[PDB]
Amino acid sequence: SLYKLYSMQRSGNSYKVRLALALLDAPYRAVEVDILRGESRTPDFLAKNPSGQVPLLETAPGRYLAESNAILWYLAVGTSLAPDTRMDRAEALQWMFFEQHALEPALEDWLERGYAALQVMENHLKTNDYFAAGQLTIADIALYGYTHVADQCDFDLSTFPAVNAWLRRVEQTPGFITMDWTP
Amino acid sequence: SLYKLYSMQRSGNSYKVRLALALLDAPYRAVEVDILRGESRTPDFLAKNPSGQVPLLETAPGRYLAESNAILWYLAVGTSLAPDTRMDRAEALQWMFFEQHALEPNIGSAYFWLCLVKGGRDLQTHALEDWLERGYAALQVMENHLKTNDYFAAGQLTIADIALYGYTHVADQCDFDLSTFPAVNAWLRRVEQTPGFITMDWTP
């Protein structure tokens, strides 16, 4: 369309972006990138993103945006997934930055750190239905990405009922797609 | 004055926000919070941020914004540290999100443990060579970019530079050797020569 998204199916960060696109009903051309093989290591891919990371959003002819949270912000500007005021927007960024150091993956520290992140999320959701601005934003979608993978990959979340009720809210949003959905 | 910042003097995250406030010439009132003496974990503090996070920016009375990089964004909207186009703004955030998963966890932990926590090297001997390994891979992403760019986003000084500056500037003090990264080092000096620049030891 314009948007070409370089994406990997079973990647939390890539799913975030596909989920936002679906909730936005934004048309895009999708390009599957096989890491756990070689495809994000190639010179041609490194020509687009030096860090060799997926997802990657081609925003202009040969102009690319990396970092899923940044891509989410980009795609949400002026839409229903960005809140209205400067403070509410910052509040969404706050939870997105949190997700980026607290949930995004020395294996103990990450599992322990994620569990404590889960408690922080739980505590907030006790009194709030959504992470920021009292509505669904890109902050809920960012956080959904990996909390979902945990959910969908056997992790015991039974002690986090507020998180579980929030996950259901997201899934019940019109346009929601699961991580193994394809067009 | 306009804002209240809860800040730790020797914290790199806190210093990011102080640097932005100096560069913006923004009037504010500092409240010192010492992480190392458990001071963010008291009832009174947990009341404003339930996660013990410093820095914290009070906007409204009893409304606190956490996360140094979200604070930076908030302070910069409508300022010369914010770029113009939608794409340039998103690139600034791109680099700040990069700082969040690539610098903070490696160069920042290195800084915290090796420079800030008394006898902390011995506490983290297992973590070190990853911090180094992963921090150098980040500095390289930065070097490679700074080859054809003077600033991280939009061709100008933005909050992305300030965010990256926070830990980048203390790396050589914490077991990184920056001699192999001239573009990085030229960038640090460029940031330091911005009018209104303050160092991490400058007091409000």
Query: Best mutation site among B53, B71, B93, B109 for testing chain A: the one with the most A CBs within 10 Å?
Result: B93
**Which amino acid is residue A118, in one-letter code?**
L
Cβ <8 Å between B59 and A87: yes
- Short-list A112, A106, A114, A107, CA closest to A145: A114
CATH number given to B83-199:
1.20.1050.10
Give the list of residues 6+ apart from residue A93 with CB closer than 8 angstroms, or none.
A73, A139, B67, B69, B70, B73, B74, B93
Q: In the block, which residue shows the tokens 């996660």?
A: B51
Name, in order, each residue with C-beta under 8 angstroms of B97's C-beta and a sequence gap of 6 or more. Answer: A67, A69, A70, A96, A97, A100, B69
Q: Are B145 and B152 contacting, i.e. CB atoms less than 8 angstroms apart? A: yes
* CATH class in words for A2-82: alpha beta
Alpha-carbon distance of A183 to A104, in angstroms, equals: 26
Contacts of B121 (CB under 8 A, 6+ apart): B113, B114, B128
* SS3 (DSSP) at A6: strand
Distance in Å, alpha carbon of A163 to nearest chain B alpha carbon = 17
Residues sharing a CB contact under 8 Å with residue A114, sequence separation 6 or more, in sequence order: A102, A103, A150
Tell me if B104 and A104 make a contact (CB, 8 A cut-off). no
* Strand-by-strand arrangement of the B56-58 sheet: B28-32, B3-7, B56-58, B64-66
Considering only CB atoms, B65 lies closest to which of A59, A60, A94, namely A94
By C-alpha distance, the chain A residue nearest B106 is A101
Dihedral, CA of residue A168, residue A172, residue A175 and residue A179, to nearest 10: 30
Please state whether the peptide bond connecting residue A55 to the residue before it is cis, i.e. omega within 30 degrees of 0: yes
Q: In chain B, whose CA is at the least distance from the CA of A70?
A: B94
In angstroms, the separation between the Cα of residue A113 and the nearest Cα of chain B is 12
Binary contact (A94, B70; C-beta < 8 A): yes
Backbone angles phi, psi at B28, to 5 degrees: -160, 165
Resolution of the structure, angstroms: 2.0
CA distance A66 to A51: 9
| A59·B87 Cβ contact <8 A | yes
Distance CA B124, CA B174 (A): 13
Residues in CB range of A119: below 8 A, 6 or more apart: A160
DSSP character string of A91-154: HHHHHHHHHHHHT---HHHHHHHHHHHHHHHHHHHTS-SSSSTTS--HHHHHHHHHHHHHHHTT
Pick the CATH number of A83-178 from 1.10.40.30, 3.40.1710.10, 3.40.50.720, 1.20.1050.10: 1.20.1050.10
Q: How deeply is B55 buried, as exposed, middle or buried, from its count of CB atoms within 10 A (0-12, 13-18, 19+)? A: buried
Please answer yes or no on whether A94 and B127 come within 8 Å at the CB atom: no
Other beta carbons within 10 angstroms of residue A19's beta carbon come to 24
Instruction: State how far the Cα of A125 lies from the Cα of A100, in Å rounded to an integer.
Output: 19
Do residues A57 and A3 touch, judged by C-beta distance below 8 A? yes
Report d(CA B15, CA B23) in Å as an integer: 12
**Alpha carbon of B4: minimum distance to chain A alpha carbons (Å):** 15
List, in sequence order, every beta strand (DSSP E) within chain B. Answer: 3-7, 28-32, 56-58, 64-66
- 3-class secondary structure, A168: helix
Contact of A92 with A133, CB cutoff 8 Å: yes
* Residues in a beta bridge with A58: A4, A64
Residue among A11, A71, A74 at smallest CA distance from A39: A11
Q: Which residues pair with B29 in a beta bridge?
A: B4
The pair of structure tokens assigned to A1 is: 């369309």
Q: Where are the domains of chain A?
A: 2-82, 83-178
